[PDB]
Symmetry: D2
Subunit: 276 residues, 4 copies
């Protein structure tokens, strides 16, 4: 009785009729994968789960990352604990695609909502596929084939993360380990083949084949275009929600409007491959 209800023409669907606290069937798994490929971000409501169950579910869709730094669930290290009482979250309140400064950015993620404020803290997603398709033909033709530099320091500037000696030493180390690198401006989804804009305000600094002046103008245009309401959805969280999204062709934005109230999410991240 697995049911998929599209939320919006551009992206998003809600899944019901499946219980992911236990192992899903082969058919359910293929149905959800298909739903991911078509709808890009999937939501389940009233789906309480623990870390082990969250991990077993996410692992049906790829291999899982174990973060070395972020707080973790001890018995299930694939599940990262995001608790605002404990951890900074700043990088979330700006449109971004996860870790695109990496050679192989995350495939996507499964988020479970554990403890929420009464309201506030919505999360928006935008589809690079719908956004690319909506560009005029001359722009699609110009951009398809160009490359862009991505740089972690765009979201984690020395100005905010190098205030003290400890933080500074941390920043310089991350800088050293993640030099800027390039990805296609227009990414072909490695499974569906759907083409998507693949720049994001969070990490993209320069379209390589344009001059500095041109690149600045084109990126400002693309950042605005790709985050228009036509290409996005907005989720208002409820406890025990699960979100599962494809980070290869979307961006997201976490609204920062609920401080100082506590919010706790659990996150499992699926390893991705080289964008092309």
């Amino acid at each position: 009785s697995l049911t998929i209800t599209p939320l919006s023409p551009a992206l998003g669907a809600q899944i019901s009729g499946v219980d992911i606290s236990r192992d899903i069937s082969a058919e359910e798994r293929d149905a959800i994968e298909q739903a991911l490929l078509q709808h890009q971000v999937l939501f389940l409501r009233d789906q309480p789960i623990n870390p082990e169950q969250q991990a077993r579910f996410a692992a049906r869709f790829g291999d899982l990352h174990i973060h070395p730094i972020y707080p973790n669930v001890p018995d299930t290290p694939q599940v990262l604990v995001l608790d605002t009482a404990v951890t900074d979250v700043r990088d979330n309140a700006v449109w971004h695609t996860d870790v695109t400064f990496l050679p192989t950015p995350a495939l996507g993620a499964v988020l479970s909502a554990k403890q929420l404020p009464a309201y506030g803290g919505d999360t928006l997603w935008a589809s690079g596929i719908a956004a690319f398709e909506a560009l005029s033909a001359p722009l699609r033709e110009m951009l398809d084939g160009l490359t862009a530099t991505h740089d972690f320091t765009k979201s984690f500037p020395l100005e905010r993360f190098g205030t003290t000696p400890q933080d500074l030493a941390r920043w310089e180390a991350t800088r050293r380990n993640n030099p800027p690198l390039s990805h296609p401006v227009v990414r072909t989804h490695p499974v569906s083949g759907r083409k998507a804009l693949f720049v994001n305000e969070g990490f993209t600094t320069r379209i390589n084949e344009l001059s500095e002046l041109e690149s600045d103008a084109l990126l400002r245009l693309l950042f605005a275009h790709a985050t228009r309401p036509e290409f996005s959805i907005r989720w208002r969280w409820q406890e025990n929600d699960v979100a599962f999204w494809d980070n290869r062709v979307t961006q997201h934005f976490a609204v920062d409007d609920y401080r100082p109230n506590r919010r706790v999410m659990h996150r499992a991240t699926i390893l991705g491959d080289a964008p092309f």
Copy 2:
């Protein structure tokens, strides 16, 4: 009893526990009015209503406008019938505040959702109050006291009216009846006293006390600022929804992602007073 559930800290509330298809009590009216003053846009789901009932409800909150052009319900002409079969809408997918080119723009309006596409057609609202309060102090201090020109031709350029000499002349006719005019950039809500940004991309052409070049830059900034996710909400419609918003301190955006599917809405518009 009547229940008010906020949808986000910046604006928006859902109301349940009240049947607005009948004459509401004085206390219900006041509960809704004060919810409007706080939350700025209100939604009721599962509220089927006919045009007579919708007009009687809306009239509890001010005097109603009968629009001289658009199609209406003949037995209840205060209710505009907004159709797909009877209308085009190439001026809703721009952020706007209704008829701000008038000396007394609408107080607000009540929309009833009659027949909808399976999905698409969301409407967003943004709070000028939240957006104003979030500007840095120096910008708030600069803008509060300035004025801006609003001009219907911004959204209805001569080329739209169109081709013949009749339309130049009838466009000049509407121009003469609706010359460009000014409103405060920072409006004080005439009931609650809350201050709000009061410019909108649909009609605001110029901040009068700035140069053309400065104004162009500041308006582009304010248009982007005021429509950030932090100050907005996004409503996904269901048949028999009712939305009631305060047009004195909000803007809205109708997502253009459902054409040519039919979408029928009935609207009552409440008359407003002079912004200050």
Copy 3:
């Protein structure tokens, strides 16, 4: 005898050793023509001429226009008098190419400096050829083949030119007679074959094959790019100067920094053909 001294690599040359107050030979005319095709704007100093001599000189390079509205020399109506004591030249202080809202914008013009303030009032010219060549290849490739709308109302807005009955009626007549029209974004010079950007902030409102959002961004980029120092020159006038420029591939900007001091120029305008 005829001597040509470039003022900069991008454009501009001073010419000397020819008396243009007399009928110049075919050889001299031809050398000046070649200098125009190369350098795009030419300056002769210490070149006193009267309107009849100015008209005979300009007419060697094409047919002359007799402008309907502006003041001109009675016995030489091909020469327009631009006297700030009479006519306001406040709208020459924006980068523009002359009358590109016409299906056949002027080929060029010959300007004679009659009476000048002690200082101030410089005029700058920028080269569409140099500007086009400096764009990166992907941008050159995208733009070459696109078209753009040009509209006299952009430099002649109703707000400034429609404020009296006579002003409005003249603005309407002009509007009826000159609806917006299109030209290539990248123009091929009809004699030299040299390609040039052919948009200008004065009149260009829209790149037609891009969306409004995209066009606005690309035009703001191009308006800024085309007017950078690398592609322009700045002329400090002296009495009896003559400037002769090719309006097919340049823009110019008259600095308004000398009011209320009186400035008087005489201008002859050469008729152009359809841009392609």
Copy 4:
């Protein structure tokens, strides 16, 4: 000594004084007044040698000896900018000199030794004229705000190189020249005239505005301040001298003449803390 204005916003040509020799107290003070009014001063047909150039510049403040760029060994206050040796493409962006320092240069004197036949113009823009041209509400908002200046805006990591040795040098340079702040509207420490004091080369942020607001306001100000109304464009001739006030101007040296050789000699005058 004659002073001829070149433009309402800024610029004057000086003649009737031989600056290859020592000038009188009155001549020095006349030139100082001209600098305070016109902000950028030019002399033509003024051959000078390095010793004479340093002696002249030193009348207007103490001179800096640059730690990196080539100089005249007998007169090390005179820096040699010779495009056969030194790349000056960096000068082709609107900037005010070294504003990432707590005490940016007061000004500079340039002498043109060798020039291409054409190309290589230098533009200056007046922060005073640009400030005064802003509408009153905008002047009132900006006057009192501060902005961060950061050398890394013009010299990012990639400009130092990609090796670990390049990274280390860049990081040391950052530590020695950290981002710091100056008033957005600077009061000239001598004339008291107010000027916009941001520049595209080094200014990254107006501190009291949000990042979004700052980005928009700086883009407006960078464009506004460099409009033709507030600038002049100098076409060089051999033996020209330019003397300008770096406290309230920006400049832009057009890079359109390579590979033709171009040689300037420069004396740089030390400045004080902007306020």
